């Protein structure tokens, strides 16, 4: 259980909006999550999510999110993003964030009257995945591999972020990565842990694109998806 917190994302302002009372809640399950990260398609869920609790699809803009940048960032900025793992849904695993650099795509998620359709979903999914923002593209960031991979699995990558051992890494899985206290950031079930990196933008400009966070669980069979509306400029 958790969801993209800076940027705010559309997961985020749909809970401060009144919305979404569970914004950990928004899960793509049941899924083969590990060890193979980008083997399940994202049916409804999509790039941004779907929260089966309160039933809402993030994927399409409403008066509440969507409409336009939370943020403005500099091409080839290296900004700061972290997510919101829940106390009592810590699964471990790995996560990263993607922006998808066909804006064809991208704009099918930015119009309140069109909800993308499940192929949309997953071909904005596919172009997410080619615009993956690795890891190792940040100066002086160290890039692990992770604790419940073994070398050369699908698994074993450091362009995604992990999770701490599931054994503990002092500090143990995802909360161990900040070892922040709880209700750093909001969470609804058990309270909030930090989960904080860094990601270098592209090069290129826009007025309104999407992040997209993907967190393939390791504990469970399950992957969690939120985006966040930004500029590069
Ligand atoms: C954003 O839109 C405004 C108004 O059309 C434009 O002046 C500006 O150049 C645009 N910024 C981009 C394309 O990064
Ligand atoms: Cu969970
Ligand atoms: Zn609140
Ligand atoms: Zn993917
Ligand atoms: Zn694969
Ligand atoms: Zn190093």
Redesign the pocket.
């Known amino acids: 259980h958790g969801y993209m917190y800076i940027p705010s994302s559309r997961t985020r302002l749909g809970h401060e909006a009144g919305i979404d009372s569970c914004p950990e809640c928004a899960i793509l399950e049941p899924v083969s999550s590990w060890p193979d990260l980008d083997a399940a398609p994202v049916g409804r869920s999509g790039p941004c999510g779907y929260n089966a609790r309160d039933s809402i699809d993030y994927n399409q803009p409403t008066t509440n999110w969507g409409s336009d940048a939370v943020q403005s960032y500099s091409p080839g900025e290296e900004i700061e993003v972290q997510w919101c793992v829940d106390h009592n849904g810590d699964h471990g695993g790995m996560f990263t964030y993607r922006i998808c650099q066909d804006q064809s795509i991208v704009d099918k998620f930015l119009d309140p009257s069109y909800l993308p359709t499940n192929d949309e979903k997953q071909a904005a999914e596919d172009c997410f995945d080619a615009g993956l923002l690795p890891c190792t593209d940040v100066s002086g960031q160290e890039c692990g591999y992770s604790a419940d991979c073994t070398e050369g699995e699908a698994c074993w990558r450091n362009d995604w972020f992990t999770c701490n051992g599931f054994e503990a890494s002092d500090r143990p899985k995802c909360q161990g990565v900040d070892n922040a206290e709880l209700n750093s950031c909001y969470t609804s079930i058990a309270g909030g842990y930090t989960v904080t990196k860094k990601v270098k933008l592209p090069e290129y ?3 309104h694109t999407l992040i997209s966070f993907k967190w393939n669980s390791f504990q469970t069979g399950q992957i969690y998806l939120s985006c966040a509306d930004i ?3």
């Open positions: 400009t826009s007025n500029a590069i400029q």
